[PDB]
Design a protein around this ligand. Structure first.
Ligand SMILES: CCN(CC)c1ccc2cc(C(=O)N/C=C\N3C(=O)CCC3=O)c(=O)oc2c1
Ligand SMILES: O=P([O-])(O)O
Length: 321
């Protein structure tokens, strides 16, 4: 039985917590996971304060090589816009990229704005101020979200750009996906971007969005998977899953990654970290799907296993998988 520590992204923390609990019940191994946000996850794995870090934003091949790190994807999730609009219900409201970017720019201030009404012709929209909510902390969900906005709103692209931290034109800061969901729950008229679980968990209404191909789509586990169906995983695990073409492709989709050292200085711990994630691939898909995360295709799991064999070693050069 090992005691493992991980830290980082809150986007997949529900499924990592479920897998940890189930794995302790079946094997006795203990996994402690701190949801501090992807930027914190990368800092802690580089500082060696944890056995594994977690980030939704992928590190480049060069940066992994500079740091002696290896990265692998675990599950596919989706970012949704959780809203608090008395009078409307979950899924009823539709937004497109351009108008969602204009809300995040602070240009559209009311829920019954003409651009929102035109997208939603049968809906009685309230004359309520929009209360924008964004992340306070360095975040892989902000990286995904601002990567998407830069594709669909040129003003956003050219003035704010993409990052795990950006200069938000407007919006209150919430800490973690949990913090944004709490903000949205307490503020009439709020909008906040969160991984899907956090909207569903908190009984918050979420919007539909327009796909890259121009059709309204609902956020579901299958529609997150759909957004990855064109990903050529054989080329790289760092796949962009925002604004992807195809039927029912949720436009703000992302996978998420675990970071470990290639040279493991506590090799028994490294061996156990690999056994935990291998167990999750083998037996954990139902738990990920129960929490509305799509599983990676079996071919990607085989890619990860094969790369574990060639990249993860102890200080004597022997493989830990
Ligand atoms: C660091 C570990 N953290 C931090 C965020 C955890 C741990 C457990 C949970 C459980 C949740 C939860 O059980 N939701 C109720 C069900 N649920 C959904 O409907 C989808 C995912 C999900 O978990 C959650 O939303 O966030 C979590 C977050
Ligand atoms: O997953 P986050 O917490 O880095 O957004």
């Amino acid at each position: 039985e090992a005691s493992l520590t991980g830290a980082g992204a809150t986007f997949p923390a529900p499924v990592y917590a479920k897998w940890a609990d189930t794995y302790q019940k079946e094997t006795g191994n203990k996994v402690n996971y701190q949801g501090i946000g992807s930027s914190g996850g990368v800092k802690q794995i580089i500082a060696n304060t944890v056995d594994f870090g977690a980030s939704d934003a992928p590190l480049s091949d060069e940066k992994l090589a500079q740091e002696g790190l290896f990265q692998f994807p675990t599950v596919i999730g989706g970012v949704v816009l959780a809203v608090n609009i008395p009078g409307l219900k979950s899924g009823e409201l539709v937004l497109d990229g351009k108008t969602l970017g204009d809300i995040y720019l602070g240009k559209i201030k009311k829920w019954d704005d003409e651009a929102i009404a035109k997208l939603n012709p049968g809906l009685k929209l309230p004359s309520q101020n929009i209360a924008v909510v964004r992340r306070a902390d360095g975040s892989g969900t902000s990286f995904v979200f601002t990567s998407y906005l830069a594709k669909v709103n040129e003003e956003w692209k050219n003035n704010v750009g993409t990052g795990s931290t950006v200069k938000w034109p407007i919006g209150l800061g919430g800490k973690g996906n949990d913090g944004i969901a709490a903000f949205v729950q307490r503020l009439p008229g709020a909008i906040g971007y969160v991984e899907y679980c956090y909207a569903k968990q908190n009984n918050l209404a979420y919007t539909k969005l327009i796909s890259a191909d121009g059709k309204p789509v609902s956020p579901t586990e299958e529609n997150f998977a759909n957004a990855a169906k064109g990903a050529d995983w054989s080329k790289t695990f760092a796949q962009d899953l925002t604004n992807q073409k195809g039927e029912d492709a949720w436009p703000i989709t992302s996978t998420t990654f675990i970071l470990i050292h290639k040279d493991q200085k506590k090799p028994e711990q490294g061996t156990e970290v690999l056994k935990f994630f291998d167990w999750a691939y083998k037996t954990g898909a139902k738990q990920a799907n129960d929490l509305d995360y799509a599983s990676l295709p079996d071919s990607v799991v085989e890619q990860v296993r094969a790369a574990w064999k060639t990249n993860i070693k102890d200080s004597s050069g022997k493989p830990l998988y």
